Symmetry: C4
Subunit: 293 residues, 4 copies
Amino acid sequence: WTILHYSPFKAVWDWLILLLVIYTAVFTPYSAAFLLKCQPLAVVDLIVDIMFIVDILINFRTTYVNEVVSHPGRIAVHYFKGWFLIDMVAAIPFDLLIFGSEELIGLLKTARLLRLVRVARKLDRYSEYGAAVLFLLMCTFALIAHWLACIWYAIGNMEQPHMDSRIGWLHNLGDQIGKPYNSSGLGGPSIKDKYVTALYFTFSSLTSVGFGNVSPNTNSEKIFSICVMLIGSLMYASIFGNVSAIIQRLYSGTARYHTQMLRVREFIRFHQIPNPLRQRLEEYFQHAWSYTN
Amino acid sequence: WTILHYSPFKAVWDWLILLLVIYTAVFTPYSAAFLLKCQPLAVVDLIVDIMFIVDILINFRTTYVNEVVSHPGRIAVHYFKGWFLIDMVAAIPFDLLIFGSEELIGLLKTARLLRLVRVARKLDRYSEYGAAVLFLLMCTFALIAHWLACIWYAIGNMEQPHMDSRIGWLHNLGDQIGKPYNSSGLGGPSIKDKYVTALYFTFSSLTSVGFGNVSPNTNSEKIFSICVMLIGSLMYASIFGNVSAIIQRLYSGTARYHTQMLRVREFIRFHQIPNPLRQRLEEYFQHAWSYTN
Amino acid sequence: WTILHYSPFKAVWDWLILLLVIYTAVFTPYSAAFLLKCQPLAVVDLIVDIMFIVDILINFRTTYVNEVVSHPGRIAVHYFKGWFLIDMVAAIPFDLLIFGSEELIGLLKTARLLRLVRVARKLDRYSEYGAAVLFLLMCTFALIAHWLACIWYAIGNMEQPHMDSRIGWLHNLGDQIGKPYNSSGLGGPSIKDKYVTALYFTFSSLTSVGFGNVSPNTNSEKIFSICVMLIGSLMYASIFGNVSAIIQRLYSGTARYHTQMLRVREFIRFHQIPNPLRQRLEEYFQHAWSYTN
Amino acid sequence: WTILHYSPFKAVWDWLILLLVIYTAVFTPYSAAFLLKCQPLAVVDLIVDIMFIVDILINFRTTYVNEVVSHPGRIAVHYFKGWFLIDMVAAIPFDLLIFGSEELIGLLKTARLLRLVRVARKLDRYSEYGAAVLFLLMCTFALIAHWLACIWYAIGNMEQPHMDSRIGWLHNLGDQIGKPYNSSGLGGPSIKDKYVTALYFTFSSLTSVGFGNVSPNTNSEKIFSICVMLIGSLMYASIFGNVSAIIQRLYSGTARYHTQMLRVREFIRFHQIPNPLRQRLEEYFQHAWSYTN
């Protein structure tokens, strides 16, 4: 058998895989930055890896447009000559394959971020609806702020064994919250204190609030903030440009309505129309508009 | 008898109830955050509650459009099947009904914020005029900045008995203004010092100035600032998008005028028109424009 | 005799009076804030007051449009029934009239700020040219930042005799630049240090940089910053809205050119036009455009 | 012989000279600010000066439009009466000519910044392509942020021998990174620490983050920040205005597509079209669009 790409199943499956890609975009960068050295997130990662493998089987058994193509040989060769390479690299279980340092093995799971390409392929499904693209834009904003928080903690953490002698942002965090790093390397803030501070700093830099209790102090932290300021400015010209445009697109019925109403009102003023005829004109405009949009 | 919904009375009553909803939106969040443990604001709340009850009686005795409907039975059943439930929940005097802790009784008056729905219903009256919608947008800005100041003080205050050991924003405020909290819990800033600082911080976060004498230090304060940065960015794409668009709408006569004037001027340049004919052309344009707009 | 309102004299005089209004808008707020307790600015103020009196005589002897009116009686009665009241209040020499405290006498010269109305009247002359309105918008920005610097110093200075006990912004300035206020009230920063810091703070608040070495600390300073954040946000929706629109208006020839060029290029692509005919099409487009704009 | 100005050689040479102008715009301001008192950048400057001299020879031997002109006498006299003066001032090797203080000799090489005029002349080549003008706009942003970093270090450095007594930004930098200036003038930060901090401050001021670990403290630093706030605001109204407009221009196919699709969808809703005819309408729209754009 074979699946039609416009069926109610394949429509729901493509919206379900968007939510599993959003899960991968959150918990893969987090695990690679904060957790290096079954549990619920270890079995949920296994379930989600199994669903991204089931999606390869669905991609071998779904129709496509050349007019629709429905023969399994003409489907399978199209997927092989298309995206199958990226989909298999995003699905090889390197962590279960390898037996070689656990730092590299935990970092190598960042290959799962190729699952973001499954959202870039399918944008013709997701972008069609105004409330869906406005959701995607705010999740692109929150995911970029999260990925930058993982890089900012990777920088701030690597400068402790490559020791800066109390200069970088983690030593300042320890002193500010009353959880100082001891001279032996003991103590210091928790993973919640470090993550919530790293995410607070990257929203503060991207939205340009710059609150000044977290501030970049070593050269790698200053060079990172120059990059976040070049990202955040292009990203405000693009994301919040598009969000304000989509808000105006949803508002376009109201914008057209008031523009034609103001023309009718200014016409009624300019000709000084008597009340019985004025009411007939402005009531007819409201009927004609509320009928045809 | 019965009231016509377009009458000069019902027009003025709907603008008066907007001002009583703006009073509820200010003094209910303030009393629930800053004042928990007749006076003028106790009797003014009683007068305003009585007017929001009188408005339920007016809503039972006003006509509506199906063509207008004027029979009191067809009015009353329409209000019951419509908004009467929300209007009665917004008008039950819980504080006068109950006899059971005074913290809960003072918090339960936040049900009065359902009166904001009386403004959302009637937007077809209020949004029709450019100076009125520009006022509403600046009051939505100032009321969101005020509601966030009440949440920010609720957070900063709750972390003192759930004691942070001198980390949160109220201990920093006490040290900055020369009114420190003593080790016994005595002293500290006044309600004016705490409110004006909380409102200053939420305008500073929403407008993105981030002045850095008030800055979020505990995890609940940092998680609150991440929310205020996600609000403030969507809200600049929406409120100050609409305010700049309404300013351009009020300016649209001037924008059209200069666009048609520049076309006439560039035409007069391109054909190199002699002075007597040039004056006749550019004076006729000013007459035709100042006549028809 | 009588002056034609479109003459080369009256055109140059109205541009000269704009520069004397910009001088009044700078040096009147500055003198009222920073200098209270001949010199070049004392004689230049006398020369400029004499020119704003000569302008009243020109306003009695210039034609106006009802068709032009040229009889001196029909001119003089029109100026009396129009703006003469504001022009005389802006020209009464109160400082030379009075003989009663010198604080009030120096403050009373702020009546000269009614000369800003001479710019608001004549906007039909000034707003006609794109480079002139873009200059006016940047001078409205710099003059609002300057007037707010004069209010910010008036607040910060009045809280020293109404003594805050070392809390307000002037005590912090003295400590930061190494010019502390002594306990006797001696020492402290110069008028250059206080003015340049006050103007730096109001550009930092209006443009929303918020650098955090000057920050508002008393309640009057925090309430002032809430006002500067409500001004600066409406003012970015209006001034830098209009500056970006005027930049796009000056760019409109280039925007039209590339829009029609891209249509011609996409047409040439879609029909796959052969090179000799393609060159004839795209050269003809450049000739037709460079001829007619 | 003579070169056609539209030839594949002259097209590639004008794109190569853009990259050598971007090199001059980086390393000339840097050398004049940071390095005053063969190496790779000394021989690369010699190679690049030789290529800007070869470009004068190409400018004497290239055709131009009056219809094209191809006689070497009518070319050479046009270049002499045009830009040859600026091109020779940008190419006189003052550093190799002179033998008189090395401070002045190193500063005098800033005449090479006249090579930026070779980009301003040729904008009809570079501005034609959307990805090229979006690159130019981000390089104008990064080059203005770099030139301001060179001025900011020139100010901060000149106030050390014109000694401020520990007030300016370089003394604060030395104390913040754990590399203090000693009382003898010994020690202090490296050229990497000073450059990366100066560039971090000017991106922080232009993008308006204002992080508050670097902040202007002397009057020349405050007057510089008032200028960077007047630049950064005009520059956001212009550069990020144009970048957001070019992003919308690249998006214009998608914006047109969804606007016509939404009209077709709302028409199909309003007439309640049966499924077989609906599919024929919305498939025909996709064919017609994907054919003609």
